[model samples]
Target: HLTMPYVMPGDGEVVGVGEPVAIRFDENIADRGAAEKAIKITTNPPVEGAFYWLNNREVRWRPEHFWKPGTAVDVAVNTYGVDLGEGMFGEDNVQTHFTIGDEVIATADDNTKILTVRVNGEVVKSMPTSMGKDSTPTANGIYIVGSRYKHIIMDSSTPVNSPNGYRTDVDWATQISYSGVFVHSAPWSVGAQGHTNTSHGCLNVSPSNAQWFYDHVKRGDIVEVVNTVGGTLPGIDGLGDWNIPWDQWRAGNAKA
Candidate 1:
């Protein structure tokens, strides 16, 4: 006699703008189609978006562009009634609510060694930061504040070490880089804050200032980095994507 495992839908919660939203399965799902079918999405103000499979166990949904300002969205997972192969069926359902707020301004400049931050067009903070080194300079472009965390250990593997010598466990220290390029601490380089610029490629902020900036800034805050001394910015950083005339970014969507 063989016993099959049950595939209950995981807890589903709505994520506001700048929040980290993800869909995960209870077990490794080999069937992609069936897995996707079990998930559902609905927006009150209907926006163009798509769910991309990060892997067999996880999926992420993103609008052709990031979520629009002042929009409401919902996510539902009806795993309770769906069969997940191996005789397993969903045991639970998930539902969540989220809303996008007004637009904010955030920008970075290598020449000035400062990351300009604003809320609703009003300048809130001008925190100093260190960009990437000359060799692997930070991408000079605009990136949305994808996520935020109060305390995060800075992993040395990212932007510091190459793939051949990746060290996943060696932590450099604790810092805050909600996005990939902007972080908020460098006790190791306290000697250089506001005076000289130096870092792997992330913007470094002082502890006090970082904490202040972190507490005040919200997700969806625009962060733009520009005029790097070394290299040009990449399109992936959401720079060209956001700067593109509204019509163009809208055109990049499937249901536009």
Candidate 2:
């Protein structure tokens, strides 16, 4: 009686375009392989994308490229009657569809210490940025500016501990990776941005820059970070799907 499953980006919900379709179950699925094989997506026009498991109960599907703004997306999980093992069989099917919104893409350069914002290929703003210090350089890769918040408390030691860390409250925080990387307002680093690498591994921008950037980004919007010693983003971390080669990414699909 307690195990109904739910598909996210729920029917008719207008989510930020950067976000992906996710399915979560009330109970853990024992046969991950079977569940993965049962999900499907239908688009107005064919598109390239793949699914990845966040865990046994949750899986996410992301387009190979950020979806074209205003495209239609529909998803379904035909897992009904499928054996999930552990004596649990799927109880029902699921479906959802939503409209994609506007597209925003940001390009951040670590070497130049600047970020350029664009909306539908039109340049909106360009401002100086400060990135991970030489000791802890920011990663280089294309990413989806996945999450946004008005303020967030940060400790450089997250996920891993470091003696040189500082705990601080930040404004206009936008997450770009799972391993504690963020692009947030950093007044303290203003003197260093556009001059030298500083902060942990985040792209530190001014208050004005951060706020303006935050106001324009959507969940699935692309934010590319490049020109640093840090390498490309990994596929499993924060919409790093665009960082992988096409052939390789397609081959990693659960339904492939």
Candidate 3:
């Protein structure tokens, strides 16, 4: 018997509008169509959305646009005894519900070297920062906040094709991309911050500002970067799903 192992935004979670509802199965699904069919999503004050498979074992769904603040979302995976092909049968049903909170967005401009944060469309904070240098320019696109950390070890050389090598502990690291892009504290780059770009590919902000951002922003908040040379972040990277055009996104729906 196969079963769904996990779901994102577990019941009662309050998340940002960009959060995608993710589902993971314990076993590889041979009939993705069957699996997708068993999943149901409903939103209060209804909105349109589509599902895209990340791989054979995981799938995610996101709204056509950012969800409206205060909206309610529910997901039901009714797979109990459902045939998933390859002689596999689902074991049980699962579900989760979450609420959409405020619309929080942070826009980082390469020309200005500043990050502006807004909540519910109201400007909240503008912080001086530095982004990836020319050699490793940050991707320009709409990114959804992924994870937050008060302290973390980052090693630039861990990747086989990385351009730089540095292993250090960072504070208030907020990840925006699965491919090692983050907004974190960098006191060493204080002089360069707001004046020029100096980091590898991460945004470097002051400790205070990084802490403020880490504290205020929640999962699914928008983090946009503009006028950069590294091209757009692909939809498969973290929650970069928002970067995909609606037409393209809808076309990728497995059960559409």
> Each candidate's TM vs. the true structure?
0.65, 0.85, 0.94
The C-alpha stretches of model 1 lying farther than 4 A from their native spots are 1-21, 84-89, 140-152, 155-182, 187-195, 219-222, 227-256
lDDT order, best first, reads: 3, 2, 1
* Candidate 3 Cα RMSD (Å): 2.0
Report the C-alpha lDDT of model 3 over 109-225, residue by residue, as the tens digit.
988888999998889999998998988788899998989999999876656354475677999999998888899999999999998888778999999999998999999898999
lDDT of 2 by residue, 1-256 (tens): 2345688676885555566777788788777677778888887666767766666677777676677777788988887877876888888999888877777778888767788888878888887988887777778887766778899988665533446577779999988888777789999989987988877788899999888877877566778888988767786674675676666655654433
Question: 1-256 in candidate 1: lDDT tens per residue?
Answer: 1112222122332222433245666576555556557767776578665544434555555565556666776777667667766665666777766676666656667777876776666777776777676766776654555445666555655444554222222122222232245556666666765556677677777777667656655554556668877554443333223433344433332221
TM-score, prediction 2: 0.85
Per-residue lDDT value at 52 in model 3: 85
Clashes of 1: 8
Deviation in Å, model 3, residue 209 alpha carbon: 0.6
Cand. 1 Cα-lDDT: 0.55
Ranking by TM-score: 3, 2, 1
Q: For candidate 1, what is the TM-score?
A: 0.65
Superior by lDDT: candidate 1 or candidate 3: 3
- Which structure is stronger by TM-score: 1 or 2? 2
Q: Which ranges of candidate 3 are over 4 A from the true structure?
A: 156-162, 253-256
Provide the lowest-lDDT 10-residue window in model 2: 155-164
